[PDB]
Structures are given as structure tokens and as C-alpha cells.
Amino acid sequence: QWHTNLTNERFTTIAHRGASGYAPEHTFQAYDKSHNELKASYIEIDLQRTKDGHLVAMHDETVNRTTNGHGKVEDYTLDELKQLDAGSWFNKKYPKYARASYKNAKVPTLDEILERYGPNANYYIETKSPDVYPGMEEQLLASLKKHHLLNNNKLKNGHVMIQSFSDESLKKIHRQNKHVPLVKLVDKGELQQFNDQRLKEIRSYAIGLGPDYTDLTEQNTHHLKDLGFIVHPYTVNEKADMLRLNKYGVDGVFTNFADKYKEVIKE
Numbered sequence: 492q493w494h495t496n497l498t499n500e501r502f503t504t505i506a507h508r509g510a511s512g513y514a515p516e517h518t519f520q521a522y523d524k525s526h527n528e529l530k531a532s533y534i535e536i537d538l539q540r541t542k543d544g545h546l547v548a549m550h551d552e553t554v555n556r557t558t559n560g561h562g563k564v565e566d567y568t569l570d571e572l573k574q575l576d577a578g579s580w581f582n583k584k585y586p587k588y589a590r591a592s593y594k595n596a597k598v599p600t601l602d603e604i605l606e607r608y609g610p611n612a613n614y615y616i617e618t619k620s621p622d623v624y625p626g627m628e629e630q631l632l633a634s635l636k637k638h639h640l641l642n643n644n645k646l647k648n649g650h651v652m653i654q655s656f657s658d659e660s661l662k663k664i665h666r667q668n669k670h671v672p673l674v675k676l677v678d679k680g681e682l683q684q685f686n687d688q689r690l691k692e693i694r695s696y697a698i699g700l701g702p703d704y705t706d707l708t709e710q711n712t713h714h715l716k717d718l719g720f721i722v723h724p725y726t727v728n729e730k731a732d733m734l735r736l737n738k739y740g741v742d743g744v745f746t747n748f749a750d751k752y753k754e755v756i757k758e
């Protein structure tokens with residue numbers, strides 16, 4: 492009596508920020524690698540937004556960690572943000588995985604990503620609390636429509652998952668479009684803070700739950716599955732954790748190493 496993935500996979504492989512173990516996160520280089528090379532199921536995208544309102548792929552609110560710039564994304568126009576090197580940081584930080592072609596990798600827009608990988612790819616897209624980037628949900632749904640991904644064929648086939656820590660962001664999307672699959676993201680320590688009534692009211696808009704993997708036991712995974720959730724823990728990079736959680740009966744993981752999870756599905 493347990494819901495499975497919409498993709499027709501028993502275990503789905505969410506490429507966390509693209510192939511971010513091997514390539515600079517949230518770049519074409521990284522998304523190319525996990526989509527085309529490693530054959531991961533999802534392209535996972537974190538949304539920020541520029542000064543002039545463009546949705547972009549970046550994990551932090553600031554450009555500091557992953558570029559040769561400093562400051563918040565919203566303090567850059569798109570033109571200015573496109574001058575930044577979003578790849579050389581990765582060569583410094585992980586020299587065994589370094590590549591000369593990663594130098595001067597660019598921050599991609601959401602529009603560019605959806606264009607590049609097209610309507611047949613699957614996307615796992617993250618929104619914020621509604622007070623950090625007001626309008627971002629409406630912008631996101633509009634960009635999805637433009638790229639033929641809100642077509643309800645595409646939706647029931649798991650081509651779009653929208654994830655957030657924010658209830659209010661997800662509830663907003665559920666009102667504007669009840670067909671888009673929604674994934675509630677859970678903090679470290681937070682899953683245990685939540686009773687059945689809370690899990691029921693989450694369940695009224697989210698099919699998906701995305702806890703920190705270290706909060707998952709066999710007992711609680713089974714409980715969440717009995718409540719009708721698809722469970723996709725984050726971020727699982729080690730093969731021993733991958734196997735352990737798959738045996739709990741999760742439906743997939745967010746991972747920096749998509750090859751490793753797909754090997755565990757096999758082995």
C-alpha cells in the first residue's frame with residue numbers, strides 16, 4: 492500500500508547540483524555529466540534570483556563559495572553574474588577532479604537549463620521562503636509552462652518535482668497548480684520533532700518528503716511510507732549508507748556521486 496516514483500523507477504537517482512562530486516555544482520559541465528554521461532534520473536536545481544529578476548541555479552544566496560565574486564546573487568544583474576567564473580573554485584578545492592574546461596564555467600539561468608536538457612529530462616527544483624524572493628513560484632511555474640513541462644502528461648510522469656523546506660512556498664504552488672508534485676524538505680533533527688497530525692497536514696500538499704538521511708531509521712522510514720510518502724533522503728555520498736537506506740525502503744537519494752548510487756541499485 493505504498494506509493495512509488497512517478498518516473499517508473501524503483502530507485503530514482505537525484506543528481507544533487509548535477510554531477511557535483513566530479514564537476515562544479517550548478518553548471519552546464521555538471522548537469523551535462525550527470526544527465527548525459529552518468530545517466531542520473533534527475534537534474535537537481537537550487538534557485539536564486541538576480542537584481543533584474545532572472546531565476547538562476549545557485550545553492551547559496553551569495554556568490555562567494557562557488558565563484559570569483561562576492562555578494563548576494565540579487566546584487567548582481569544577469570549580465571554581471573555571467574562575467575563570473577563559476578568553475579575554477581572546484582579545481583582548487585578538489586584537485587583530483589580538476590579540469591581546465593571547468594575554468595570560466597558560467598552560472599546558468601533556469602531558462603537556459605530547461606532549454607538545454609529539454610522536455611524529456613526530469614527536474615528537481617527548489618524554492619525558498621516566500622519572503623526572500625517574492626514572485627519566485629509564479630516565475631518558476633511560468634518558465635515550466637514555456638518549456639512544455641506543465642503539460643499533465645509530463646507531470647504525472649515525474650518530469651517536475653518541486654522541493655522546499657518552506658511549507659508556505661509549497662502550499663502556494665499547490666493552490667496555483669494542484670498537479671505539480673511537491674516535496675517537503677526536512678532539516679537535520681527536525682523529522683523527530685513532527686507528530687502524525689503534522690505529517691498528515693504535510694501530506695495534503697506534498698507527496699514527497701526529503702529528510703536528512705541521518706534521521707532515518709527502518710522504523711520511521713516504514714512509518715512515512717505507510718503515510719503515503721515518497722521518501723528521498725539527502726545527501727548520501729557513501730555506498731554503505733546508500734545500501735542501508737535502500738533496504739529501509741526509500742524511493743531514491745539525493746547524491747553528489749550518481750554512478751555510486753546506480754552501482755548500489757545494481758549490486
Ligand SMILES: [Zn+2]
Pocket residue numbers: 536537617
Ligand atoms: Zn537542494
